[PDB]
Amino acid sequence: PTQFEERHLKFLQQLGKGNFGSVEMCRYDPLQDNTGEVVAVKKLQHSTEEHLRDFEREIEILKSLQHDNIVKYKGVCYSAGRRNLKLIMEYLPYGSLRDYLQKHKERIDHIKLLQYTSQICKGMEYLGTKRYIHRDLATRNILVENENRVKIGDFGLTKVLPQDKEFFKVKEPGESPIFWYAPESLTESKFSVASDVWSFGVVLYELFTYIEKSKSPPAEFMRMIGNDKQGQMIVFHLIELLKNNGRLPRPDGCPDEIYMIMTECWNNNVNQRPSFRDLALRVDQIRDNM
């Protein structure tokens, strides 16, 4: 069922909020008896014409994906007498991977981090078979179903590659998560599978820092750059730093072999970065040995 009538969609909780849209937890109860399905409902923060068109493309992308490690599309709800649009998704109860890492450290060890790493890689391989570039791969945009399962979410920045070319030039990006971007994304606005691989390197970094106090990518890059810098000066220094092999340090407790993977993902030469298939195989081989 992809129907969802607004009058049967009942509010339970406010979840995330920020850029573009906000997400609520709702119960869908057609039989009016207080016993139905729990879902996530995504709405626009500001419903302009431009944002509506983007939201429509996000919805088409999500509907096209069926994979264990990608959040499930359930449908749309045409609310306000069908003069508004909301996206209906499955509810994953443990929130973003970023929050989960902070809140549930008691149930997380290195084996679990490698499981999550592998699952993210598998999700990304699947994206590549559709020629979708995610552009925003980060622990805040990964969702946790349970202690054994994570799913890639937020496809708001996701783009399709053209017929022939391997890069997408994003004409004029708004607010940018610059500390997850590959050098070519910073200097040329060029986004590709290879730039998602760079970002994946940074996700792997986040996992092994356990999102600890002031070890996050923005905080570490700012330390190296100089905390007194502001404005475009930050970006100028980030670029120059990255072009001459400045990199995030190995987090404390992180094996050398896992840090080597990070550093291979952070190659300035786009063609020498591993594929997501290489990474999933290598990570599952590390796990299987032991």
Ligand SMILES: CS(=O)(=O)Nc1cccc2[nH]ncc12
């Ligand atoms: C990341 S968040 O905290 O804003 N919430 C979600 C977004 C998208 C799908 C979701 N399913 N469940 C929660 C959730």
